[PDB]
Amino acid sequence: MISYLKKAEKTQKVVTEMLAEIQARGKDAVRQYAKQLDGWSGDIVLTPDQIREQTKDVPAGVRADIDFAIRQVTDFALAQRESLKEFSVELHPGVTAGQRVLPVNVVGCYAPAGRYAHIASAYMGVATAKAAGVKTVVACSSPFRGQGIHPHVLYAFQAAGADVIMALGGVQAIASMAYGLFTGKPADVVVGPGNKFVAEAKRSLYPSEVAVIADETADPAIVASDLVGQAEHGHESPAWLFTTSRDLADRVMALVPELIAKLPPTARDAATAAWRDYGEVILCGTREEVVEISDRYASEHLEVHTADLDWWLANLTCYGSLFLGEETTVAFGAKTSGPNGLSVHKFMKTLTWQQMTREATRQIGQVTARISRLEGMEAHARTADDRMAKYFPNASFEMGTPVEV
Amino acid sequence: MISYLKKAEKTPETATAQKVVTEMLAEIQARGKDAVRQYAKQLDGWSGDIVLTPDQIREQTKDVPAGVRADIDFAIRQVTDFALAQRESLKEFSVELHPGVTAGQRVLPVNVVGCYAPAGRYAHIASAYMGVATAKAAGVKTVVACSSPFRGQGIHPHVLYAFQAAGADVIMALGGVQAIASMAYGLFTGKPADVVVGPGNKFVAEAKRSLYGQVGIDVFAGPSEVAVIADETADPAIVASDLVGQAEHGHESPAWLFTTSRDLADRVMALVPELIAKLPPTARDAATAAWRDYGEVILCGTREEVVEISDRYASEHLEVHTADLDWWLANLTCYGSLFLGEETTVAFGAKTSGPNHVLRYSGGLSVHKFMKTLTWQQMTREATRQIGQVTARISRLEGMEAHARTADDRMAKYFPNASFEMGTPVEV
Ligand SMILES: NC(=O)c1ccc[n+]([C@@H]2O[C@H](COP(=O)([O-])OP(=O)(O)OC[C@H]3O[C@@H](n4cnc5c(N)ncnc54)[C@H](O)[C@@H]3O)[C@@H](O)[C@H]2O)c1
Ligand SMILES: [Zn+2]
Ligand SMILES: [Zn+2]
């Protein structure tokens, strides 16, 4: 049986004008919107010199940390890129068919550079696009108080391998990258988290979760810590626990409030609200039942603190990213993003092709002709007839009764 | 050096579809199977059973002769064979990252796919089997197939035979929106569809969009297209024949020729009318308007300029009749599927369907549409020694104290007798 030991309490046109204006008047309109919305009166596209001077203050220790975190994304993305293979294959004898795998040409990456945003928000798209083999990555981020892009966001963009960096925000950023203003290189896709105008802009042109699965072997102090971890994001950050153990369920429900109370003010408020409004706890009969619930919820970030982790890897089917075991944790960072998803696959295209010998068309031609004529597709059948006549001049095959209607 | 020797004399959109679907879905959500059954009666005049039994399937396909079956069987196998190969091209793996960190990709099929087949008068039998065959090749466990009943007897017997031979698990005599919704909600089966595919009218399209969003519109829809890239070595009689091939579909089927050979362009432009004129009445009428209004011939200077304009047009079906086929394969970047060389042709059938390029590049009907990649990670204790520090220091810079403490807790548990610079805690 399933028991809800805790349940959740609670549960756009401006874009049309701006885009119509930007489309009509181009870079001119982007500059005005920059000054009107962001007070930005300076250059949009940063030079190599501007980038190094604006990030000169960033210390060596901070750079090393960010460099390390990027490498953990990049190094997975590199492996993942190779998981989609090109191939040839022979179907019917003399029929060859295959798949090419191309990166897209241009990716645009937006980062908000606001407060209580992960620096990961700035480097994930850029680092992923580059590992996928995209040759042009354009990164935008809104300027901080007419001083430029937040140095940490700017350092991240650069270290992640962005090719062009533009101090530009909101709808102007997305439109610019999509229409290819300032670079003359339209983005095949734009990615990155932002506000509601940003999201609707990306819609017209083209809340942080955490779940923990746990059994009796789990350490509730860590579980509770992990739930609290993402709870501090905002007031609408779900935090779910799915367990087969009442003891853990109760013990966690007892520690979470205490850990929240020990947080600093802003994080205390956020987590207090979030745990109350969207926090959930679910006790279940079997493992097999937990799966069912987990898969229905499909958390963006799913931790699994149980015995027999292989079983859970094998049997779970719906989630953004899986954190397997206690040691890793959501805060260490997902390598990808689930469906908002963001991975190398988002920036990769397959193209399929086929080729035939004449010998192959002997059978394929006559089947096609007969089928086409049963379909009433006389012109179709005739593309088969013509090849038969050219390749097999004195052949008489059953090519089907010609259409008269 | 680009020159339009023949221009399109028309352009390719009202959403009255939106009204009907919103109403119909609203209704079907309320009353379920009874609303579906009632819509079948009002729209199609249908009163029979919905879910076919194995008996009914054999019964209704009994008058499909052995020779016709063998041809369909053959055509389905070609799709299956490509699909199985294409499935093998997306691999599972694990990789070591920072020492003690393991990460990886799981690849698995979706549970349930719904396939719709318009099964009208001028549809290809391939439309019935391509969805179903691809879904099964992908390892989808439940495939549900729907087609509106033909003439009071049931599903068109060729369509029904195709569904069965392609490996559909459940077959249902439903048309239009009510078929799409039934498959989406899992009416009659208790198995809601993860995706629904299959061509149809603007209502079927709108119903898919409404229910699935992007994954519901990302497959090539609209009239059948054909493009041919041809150089001086191409045979104009074959080229003209291939263009006319798809132009008979209807009045809005575009047929494009991109060529570096003025000579070929002129010969094709003269041959097409002659070929159309020799078609039977229905086809003649279809192709005449199709070519007149939507036929294009583009003469280019170099190979690069043909690539430029081909990628812009991005035909669902692109033939390449040139020398040096390896080069064209290497340099073309946007198309539904490629027919390399003169020997193969569009009517032999692509083994996938390309993206909805007229919305853009992503999507289409292949095994890839029916498969998910899930990523995972796992760490030893030792791995966290470095990762926890970094996370802690980064989190505190972000003002994320709770985040940092998830690392503090692990550092304290795994490494009691050790101290690390975990950043200065947040006070705000
Ligand atoms: N170029 C090609 O390759 C090709 C070939 C054949 C058909 N088509 C296109 O496919 C479509 C086939 O048309 P179809 O009618 O057979 O579609 P369909 O077979 O996809 O759907 C038919 C069903 O639609 C429903 N329906 C019809 N009119 C409706 C209405 N006004 N309101 C609500 N439901 C309604 C009915 O239930 C009917 O059974 C057309 O758009 C045609 O142009 C293209
Ligand atoms: Zn977070
Ligand atoms: Zn066709």
XYZ file of C-alpha atoms in Angstrom, chain A residues 21-383:
363
model
C 10.495 45.521 -33.480
C 13.831 43.650 -33.439
C 12.889 41.783 -36.630
C 12.052 45.074 -38.369
C 14.903 47.301 -37.138
C 17.617 44.762 -36.204
C 20.576 45.778 -34.017
C 19.199 49.324 -33.609
C 16.234 48.016 -31.600
C 18.436 45.700 -29.504
C 20.568 48.668 -28.407
C 17.512 50.728 -27.395
C 15.986 47.824 -25.439
C 19.375 47.347 -23.755
C 19.371 50.995 -22.614
C 15.666 51.004 -21.678
C 15.595 47.685 -19.784
C 19.181 47.222 -18.562
C 20.409 50.845 -18.739
C 23.194 49.530 -20.992
C 24.758 52.169 -23.234
C 28.046 50.457 -24.171
C 29.349 47.748 -26.518
C 27.418 44.467 -26.841
C 30.084 42.108 -28.215
C 33.053 41.698 -25.865
C 36.588 41.612 -27.277
C 39.333 39.199 -26.071
C 40.860 42.137 -24.161
C 37.589 43.133 -22.450
C 37.107 39.514 -21.305
C 40.527 39.157 -19.620
C 40.354 42.615 -17.990
C 36.823 42.053 -16.669
C 37.911 38.702 -15.168
C 41.357 39.790 -13.928
C 40.016 40.139 -10.367
C 38.796 36.519 -10.243
C 41.307 34.727 -7.918
C 43.291 31.600 -8.820
C 41.468 29.411 -6.267
C 38.038 30.424 -7.584
C 39.113 29.846 -11.209
C 40.490 26.396 -10.339
C 37.204 25.398 -8.657
C 35.107 26.525 -11.636
C 37.590 24.918 -14.066
C 37.221 21.620 -12.184
C 33.411 21.727 -12.197
C 33.369 22.436 -15.949
C 35.730 19.500 -16.616
C 33.274 17.169 -14.846
C 30.570 18.221 -17.327
C 32.842 18.365 -20.395
C 34.434 14.965 -19.715
C 31.031 13.248 -19.557
C 29.729 15.150 -22.602
C 32.776 13.977 -24.601
C 31.982 10.328 -23.840
C 28.282 10.886 -24.537
C 28.987 12.442 -27.962
C 30.546 9.153 -29.096
C 27.496 7.109 -28.024
C 25.632 7.981 -31.259
C 27.491 6.233 -34.073
C 27.559 6.617 -37.842
C 27.162 3.362 -39.779
C 26.552 1.669 -43.115
C 24.535 -1.541 -43.445
C 23.308 -3.905 -46.171
C 19.572 -4.648 -46.215
C 18.357 -6.636 -49.228
C 21.555 -7.629 -51.152
C 22.843 -4.593 -53.062
C 20.934 -2.134 -50.857
C 23.213 -0.018 -48.681
C 21.819 2.416 -46.123
C 23.338 4.457 -43.322
C 23.361 7.286 -40.814
C 25.535 10.383 -40.526
C 25.859 12.263 -37.226
C 26.494 16.012 -37.459
C 26.716 18.691 -34.744
C 24.565 21.755 -35.435
C 26.397 24.866 -36.679
C 25.525 27.486 -34.059
C 24.267 27.192 -30.477
C 23.174 30.228 -28.440
C 23.538 30.035 -24.638
C 21.812 32.385 -22.190
C 22.692 32.761 -18.499
C 20.678 35.011 -16.099
C 23.539 36.088 -13.783
C 21.020 36.815 -11.004
C 21.292 36.045 -7.282
C 20.763 32.468 -6.048
C 21.639 31.102 -9.482
C 24.160 28.291 -9.891
C 27.329 29.167 -11.815
C 26.559 25.807 -13.477
C 23.699 27.636 -15.250
C 26.312 29.606 -17.200
C 28.702 26.825 -18.270
C 26.409 23.799 -18.813
C 25.011 24.776 -22.232
C 28.312 26.229 -23.471
C 30.433 23.270 -22.325
C 27.884 20.774 -23.683
C 27.585 22.442 -27.105
C 31.378 22.532 -27.492
C 31.844 18.881 -26.472
C 29.156 17.989 -29.036
C 31.472 19.554 -31.639
C 29.516 22.750 -32.372
C 31.951 25.228 -33.926
C 30.196 28.477 -32.943
C 28.771 28.955 -29.450
C 27.334 32.392 -28.654
C 26.853 33.175 -24.950
C 24.765 36.073 -23.605
C 24.302 37.275 -20.040
C 22.560 40.407 -18.749
C 25.037 43.092 -17.517
C 25.219 43.618 -13.749
C 24.354 47.231 -12.925
C 26.106 48.795 -15.943
C 29.457 47.283 -14.875
C 29.382 44.331 -17.312
C 28.682 40.602 -17.028
C 29.179 39.119 -13.547
C 32.923 38.153 -13.600
C 32.166 34.566 -12.506
C 29.615 34.135 -15.303
C 32.059 35.738 -17.757
C 34.926 33.522 -16.555
C 32.671 30.460 -16.916
C 31.554 31.324 -20.458
C 35.229 31.716 -21.413
C 36.649 28.648 -19.643
C 33.785 26.545 -21.041
C 34.883 27.539 -24.563
C 32.301 30.092 -25.773
C 33.349 31.644 -29.099
C 31.377 34.894 -28.813
C 30.280 36.657 -25.615
C 27.644 39.403 -25.588
C 26.636 41.582 -22.632
C 22.929 41.397 -23.403
C 19.864 40.293 -21.456
C 16.290 39.018 -21.649
C 14.331 38.933 -24.902
C 16.976 40.997 -26.728
C 19.562 38.292 -26.007
C 17.461 35.450 -27.410
C 16.266 37.392 -30.466
C 19.834 38.546 -31.194
C 21.183 34.991 -31.051
C 18.228 33.586 -33.031
C 18.319 36.210 -35.808
C 22.132 36.181 -35.581
C 22.531 39.910 -34.920
C 26.038 41.164 -34.035
C 27.653 37.937 -35.346
C 25.891 37.246 -38.660
C 25.514 33.649 -37.418
C 21.914 32.624 -36.520
C 21.678 30.065 -33.702
C 20.217 26.687 -34.704
C 19.086 26.411 -31.078
C 19.144 28.581 -27.952
C 19.372 27.160 -24.427
C 19.623 28.343 -20.826
C 17.319 29.113 -17.843
C 15.711 32.550 -17.522
C 12.560 34.458 -16.551
C 9.092 34.168 -18.114
C 9.743 36.577 -21.010
C 12.945 34.640 -21.752
C 11.033 31.332 -21.761
C 8.219 32.698 -23.968
C 10.796 34.346 -26.251
C 12.458 30.940 -26.761
C 8.980 29.451 -27.274
C 8.012 31.993 -29.965
C 11.387 31.829 -31.757
C 11.837 28.050 -31.453
C 11.912 25.268 -10.124
C 14.700 23.053 -8.762
C 13.506 19.574 -7.734
C 15.087 16.822 -5.658
C 13.877 13.306 -4.924
C 15.457 10.723 -2.633
C 14.689 7.010 -2.770
C 15.761 5.312 0.454
C 15.426 2.047 2.367
C 16.296 1.071 5.957
C 20.038 1.123 5.174
C 19.904 4.885 4.497
C 21.352 7.560 6.800
C 18.409 9.963 7.475
C 20.728 12.824 8.479
C 22.170 12.840 4.944
C 18.765 12.282 3.315
C 17.245 15.212 5.216
C 20.296 17.357 4.413
C 19.901 16.573 0.687
C 16.199 17.521 0.648
C 16.958 20.775 2.480
C 19.804 21.385 0.013
C 17.535 22.196 -2.954
C 14.656 23.461 -0.780
C 16.594 26.720 -0.258
C 16.423 27.588 -3.988
C 12.964 29.142 -3.797
C 9.457 28.901 -2.362
C 8.385 26.502 -5.133
C 11.201 23.928 -5.066
C 9.727 20.405 -4.548
C 11.548 18.015 -2.210
C 10.334 14.408 -2.261
C 11.190 11.293 -0.260
C 10.036 7.863 -1.460
C 10.808 5.103 1.039
C 9.870 1.580 2.137
C 10.813 2.392 5.763
C 8.508 4.148 8.245
C 11.405 4.677 10.687
C 13.401 6.595 8.076
C 10.269 8.429 6.886
C 9.462 9.634 10.422
C 13.079 10.345 11.388
C 13.588 12.440 8.225
C 10.350 14.366 8.797
C 11.782 15.160 12.258
C 15.253 16.343 11.138
C 14.244 18.475 8.130
C 12.615 21.245 10.287
C 15.681 21.299 12.566
C 18.155 21.675 9.688
C 15.970 24.428 8.186
C 15.911 26.323 11.504
C 19.736 26.223 11.562
C 20.011 27.812 8.081
C 20.800 31.546 7.608
C 17.777 33.897 7.177
C 17.145 33.938 3.404
C 17.679 30.178 3.035
C 15.570 29.548 6.166
C 12.576 31.398 4.693
C 12.860 29.757 1.266
C 13.214 26.210 2.621
C 10.536 26.699 5.301
C 7.999 27.726 2.647
C 9.117 25.127 0.094
C 9.208 22.122 2.430
C 5.726 23.028 3.689
C 4.101 23.830 0.344
C 5.718 21.273 -1.994
C 7.532 18.820 0.304
C 6.187 15.252 0.120
C 6.874 11.915 1.841
C 5.612 8.581 0.487
C 5.859 5.196 2.232
C 5.517 2.126 -0.011
C 5.112 -1.645 0.283
C 7.686 -3.017 -2.171
C 10.630 -1.720 -4.186
C 8.479 -2.311 -7.275
C 5.919 0.188 -5.939
C 8.563 2.885 -5.284
C 9.565 2.669 -8.965
C 5.925 3.280 -9.939
C 5.764 6.453 -7.822
C 9.252 7.666 -8.775
C 8.469 7.256 -12.483
C 5.157 9.136 -12.111
C 6.916 12.072 -10.422
C 9.973 11.944 -12.729
C 12.126 14.226 -10.566
C 14.812 16.278 -12.344
C 17.325 15.114 -9.717
C 16.803 11.653 -8.200
C 19.018 10.271 -5.420
C 18.937 6.573 -4.513
C 20.226 5.631 -1.048
C 19.518 1.889 -0.889
C 20.998 -1.584 -0.954
C 21.257 -3.243 -4.380
C 21.772 -0.093 -6.454
C 22.117 -2.053 -9.724
C 18.462 -3.078 -9.393
C 17.379 0.568 -9.164
C 19.547 1.604 -12.115
C 17.924 -1.187 -14.132
C 14.309 -0.671 -13.074
C 13.896 3.127 -12.861
C 12.765 4.557 -16.212
C 11.740 8.215 -15.725
C 13.942 10.933 -14.226
C 16.110 13.891 -15.248
C 19.330 12.567 -13.710
C 20.184 9.684 -11.369
C 22.486 10.006 -8.358
C 23.328 6.444 -7.362
C 24.386 5.848 -3.747
C 24.949 8.168 -0.770
C 28.375 9.460 -1.731
C 27.292 11.613 -4.674
C 24.661 14.306 -4.161
C 22.562 16.694 -6.258
C 24.728 19.675 -5.251
C 27.744 18.033 -6.957
C 25.936 18.691 -10.251
C 24.095 16.696 -12.889
C 26.022 16.051 -16.108
C 22.896 16.774 -18.188
C 19.430 18.295 -17.736
C 16.146 16.392 -18.079
C 13.189 17.711 -20.158
C 12.526 21.358 -19.243
C 16.572 18.046 -22.173
C 20.088 19.514 -22.319
C 22.806 17.113 -23.490
C 25.108 16.596 -26.480
C 22.143 14.827 -28.141
C 20.252 18.153 -28.279
C 23.003 19.583 -30.507
C 23.378 16.571 -32.822
C 21.567 15.659 -36.036
C 21.196 12.308 -37.787
C 20.888 12.137 -41.569
C 19.937 8.855 -43.260
C 20.735 7.777 -46.823
C 20.254 4.793 -49.131
C 21.966 3.524 -52.288
C 21.361 0.509 -54.539
C 23.042 -1.651 -57.157
C 21.068 -2.318 -60.361
C 20.781 -5.958 -59.285
C 18.947 -4.799 -56.136
C 16.317 -2.961 -58.210
C 15.366 -6.153 -60.064
C 13.198 -7.210 -57.095
C 12.700 -3.842 -55.354
C 11.547 -2.243 -58.619
C 8.836 -4.787 -59.392
C 7.497 -4.931 -55.823
C 7.356 -1.138 -55.826
C 5.512 -1.130 -59.169
C 2.877 -3.656 -58.072
C 2.307 -1.921 -54.718
C 2.132 1.506 -56.371
C -0.489 0.303 -58.862
C -2.630 -1.258 -56.106
C -2.394 2.176 -54.417
C -3.537 3.848 -57.663
C -0.115 5.531 -57.917
C 0.653 5.107 -61.621
C 3.391 7.764 -61.799
C 5.137 6.057 -58.853
C 5.070 2.709 -60.652
C 6.506 4.382 -63.774
C 9.694 5.443 -61.959
